[PDB]
Structure formats: structure tokens, C-alpha cells
């Protein structure tokens, strides 16, 4: 009966930053994946366990849209199999994911003439995070036998670094929004399928 919220996922102007990545969940609705593939503006549609053109005729238990913003030259990290600050510390997909990653240049939407310090990524952690783990804790990361007492200094780091998305950035330094559509099948008591 109902039509899926993809129309808002790709039109909410306010997105969280990757360390605090948003999740929205799809249920009881018509999932028009194909009109996403008709989009003028998109800059990746690389998918895992699928080819995007055919998707419309398939049926699913749940879908998660996970969404955030990334510096373009590190958009490659988001998919499986590669270490890098995002995949190491902010947002890791499984050993065998199934779903699709959608991304687009956002400099016209997201940049500010000062750098937009509302955008943040974690760059220190005691160990790498597990698949779809999330961590908005911000207690000081130590770098020496110094107990940092929960306050910053030499060898005592605040965990989150900003991207600084200026208008004067090259193609790869620019902000790219990302949505990861994570799929699920199972025994399949589905409430999500395309038209």
C-alpha cells in the first residue's frame, strides 16, 4: 500500500556526521530503487551482492538506510575489505555485506566559508570497531602512561577531528554525502519490495 521514505532520506538537508552516523529503517512500503538509478546528481551507486538496475522486482525483511558525510577522496573506504580511518573507527561494513552504497558531491549544500565544524570523524580508538558498531562517546584518548583524567593535553587527544569543508577544496577534498542501503533476506517475512 504505502510508498517508502527514500524521498526524504535523499532530501533531508540536515545529516549527522559519520562518527554519529544516522540510521533510518524501511517497512510496509513500495521501494522504488529504480528512480534512484535515474538520478541526475549521483556520483556512485556501487553495490554488493547485487546489480542496481534489476532490484525493483526483489523482496526483503528489512532495509536500513544509514547516512552521513565524508571527504570525497576517502569515500572508497566505506565498502567492505579495506582499512582506513572511516572503516577502522567510524563505520565498518561486514565481511560479506549485501546492499548498496550511494554517494554524491555536496559542496553546494554542505560547505561554509569558515569550514563547517559541525562535521566530525573519530581518528583515535583503542581498537577497530565491529560491523555496524556505533560510538558517540568522546572521553579523552591517551597516547602515553599519563592518565589523562578526562581532559586534553600533550599525549591526550579529543577523539573527534573535523573535516573543514571549505568552498576552496579540490574535487576529492569536497564533502560527499553517503547513504548505505543495508539489505536483509532470511526466511523472508518481507514488508519491503519495489513496484
Amino acid at each position, epitope marked *: 500500500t504505502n510508498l517508502c521514505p527514500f524521498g526524504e532520506v535523499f532530501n533531508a538537508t540536515r545529516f549527522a556526521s559519520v562518527y554519529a552516523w544516522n540510521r533510518k529503517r524501511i517497512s510496509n512500503c513500495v521501494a522504488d530503487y529504480s528512480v534512484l538509478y535515474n538520478s541526475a546528481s549521483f556520483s556512485t551507486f556501487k553495490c554488493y551482492g547485487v546489480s542496481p538496475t534489476k532490484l525493483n522486482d526483489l523482496c526483503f525483511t528489512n532495509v536500513y538506510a544509514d547516512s552521513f558525510v565524508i571527504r570525497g577522496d576517502e569515500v572508497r573506504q566505506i565498502a567492505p575489505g579495506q582499512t582506513g580511518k572511516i572503516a577502522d573507527y567510524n563505520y565498518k561494513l561486514p565481511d560479506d555485506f549485501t546492499g548498496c552504497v550511494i554517494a554524491w558531491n555536496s559542496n553546494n549544500l554542505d560547505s561554509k566559508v569558515g569550514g*563547517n*565544524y559541525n562535521y566530525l570523524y573519530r581518528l583515535f580508538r583503542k581498537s577497530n570497531l565491529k560491523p555496524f558498531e556505533r560510538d558517540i562517546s*568522546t572521553e579523552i584518548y591517551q597516547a602515553g602512561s599519563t592518565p589523562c583524567n578526562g581532559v*586534553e*593535553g600533550f599525549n591526550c*587527544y*579529543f577523539p*573527534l*577531528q573535523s573535516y573543514g569543508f571549505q568552498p576552496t577544496n579540490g574535487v576529492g577534498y569536497q564533502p560527499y554525502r553517503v547513504v548505505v542501503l543495508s539489505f536483509e533476506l532470511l526466511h523472508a517475512p518481507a514488508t519491503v519490495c519495489g513496484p
Partner: antibody, heavy 122, light 106 residues
Framework: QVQLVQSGAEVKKPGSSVKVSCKAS????????ISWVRQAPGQGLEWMGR????????NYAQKFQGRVTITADKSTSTAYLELSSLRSEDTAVYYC????????????????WGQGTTVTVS | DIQMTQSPSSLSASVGDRVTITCRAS??????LNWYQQKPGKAPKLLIY???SLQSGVPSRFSGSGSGTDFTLTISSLQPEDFATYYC?????????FGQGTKLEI
């Protein structure tokens, strides 16, 4: 760019608490720290405590821990210091100042300062 | 925790003069130190955010130096803009204690 503007002067009886505030303009607390500094009249500057409005986390120097609390409401771009139990020796000019706790692994480089609030007793 | 000291208390100078100031730290700092000035009865402003790295919009009148402790700040072609009191401040371990300050008379 971002300009802090700061509460007018506070005259209060000894021991009775005080409240003072800073609010941003041309922006907001975009994951900056803001932190509070005394200029006691003709003394060196002294540092009171960090707050990061983006996370509400705050911490204090040993000398003020317990005497003071600092707080903020990011949606209204406003941070507050309130101090109890005042004037042991104290009638300082109080400054808020920002520092960019997410911009680098370098800290306490206070690049913008409020106008300063006189806080004092009779 | 850390302690600061800064010398001298005051200096006389002239417009166009060259002048140098020092700060010293009681634990070593690996060049985690800053410098500020304030005019009499107005807000401090930051000049330097390491031993040497100058802050944006500040004129070329200033330079700084040091190595683990015993830092310095220098004025070249001194101005009425430099009548201010100057402070050092360590950033190496909290709380970020400021110096006692120094006075320049034009």
C-alpha cells in the same frame, strides 16, 4: 568569523553566588570548546574550566572544582558560568574564550575572547 | 601542575625599535606554548600558537622561538600597536597556566 558577546557586569554581596554568560554570533558552538579565564586585577590570567557545548562535557582546574559550575544550551548558542561561595580573594574580570578542540591535536590556543565581564562585591 | 615565569616585568622602547621577551617552564613542553597581548582594560588576543607559528590577520611585526623550554617573543619595528601587555601560556598539560605578563612603554 564567529564573534562571542558577553554578559554585563555583576555586583553581588560576599559568598552569595553569581551567573555570567557568553553567546556566539555569526555562527554557533560548532564543536568548539569554550573555556573560562579570570583576569584578577593586575595578576596573571588564570584558567577555570573547559566545556564542549556539542557534548555538554565539562571539567575544571583543582582550585575551582566544587566552587564553580559551567553549562551550555547549544540550540540557543549560549554558555554560562556560575560561581558559588565567592570572594575569598575574588573580584576578577571574567573572560570566556573559545579554542578549537576538534581542529588539531593542539589545544588551548584561545583565538577569540569575549568582551569581558566585571564581577565584584561591596 | 605546571608553573610559568616570564621576564622582565617591563621595558621602555621607541617606535621602529626591535625588542625581545622570554618565558620559562618548570616542566618541559616540546613547544606546546602560545603568546597573547592585551591592551589596558580590553580582551586578550593571540599572536602565536606554537614556538613560532603566527595567528591569522596578525601583522609581520612579531616572531617567536624555543625548544622544550626557554621560549622567546620578538617585536621588529615596534609600534603604538605594541604598547600592550604580553603573556605566554603553556598548552602541554592542563590547566593551561598563563605567565605573569610583561609591560612595554613606547
Amino acid at each position: 568569523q564567529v564573534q562571542l558577546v558577553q554578559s554585563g557586569a555583576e555586583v553581588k554581596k560576599p559568598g552569595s553566588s553569581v551567573k555570567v554568560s557568553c553567546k556566539a554570533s555569526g555562527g554557533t558552538f560548532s564543536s568548539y570548546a569554550i573555556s573560562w579565564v579570570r583576569q584578577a586585577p593586575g595578576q596573571g590570567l588564570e584558567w577555570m574550566g573547559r566545556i564542549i557545548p556539542m557534548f555538554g562535557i565539562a571539567n575544571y582546574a583543582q582550585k575551582f572544582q566544587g566552587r564553580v559550575t559551567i553549562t551550555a544550551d547549544k540550540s540557543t548558542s549560549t554558555a554560562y558560568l556560575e560561581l558559588s561561595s565567592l570572594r575569598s580573594e575574588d573580584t576578577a574580570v571574567y573572560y570566556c574564550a573559545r579554542y578549537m578542540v576538534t581542529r588539531d591535536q593542539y589545544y588551548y590556543d584561545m583565538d577569540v575572547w569575549g568582551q569581558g565581564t566585571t564581577v565584584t562585591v561591596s | 601542575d605546571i608553573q610559568m615565569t616570564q621576564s622582565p616585568s617591563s621595558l621602555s622602547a621607541s617606535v621602529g625599535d626591535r625588542v625581545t621577551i622570554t618565558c620559562r617552564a618548570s616542566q618541559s613542553i616540546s613547544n606546546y606554548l602560545n603568546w597573547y597581548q592585551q591592551k589596558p582594560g580590553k580582551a586578550p588576543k593571540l599572536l602565536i600558537y606554537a614556538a613560532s607559528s603566527l595567528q591569522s590577520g596578525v601583522p609581520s611585526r612579531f616572531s617567536g622561538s624555543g625548544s622544550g623550554t626557554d621560549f622567546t617573543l620578538t617585536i621588529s619595528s615596534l609600534q603604538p600597536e605594541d604598547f600592550a601587555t604580553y603573556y605566554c601560556q603553556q598548552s602541554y598539560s592542563p590547566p593551561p597556566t598563563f605567565g605573569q605578563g610583561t609591560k612595554l612603554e613606547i
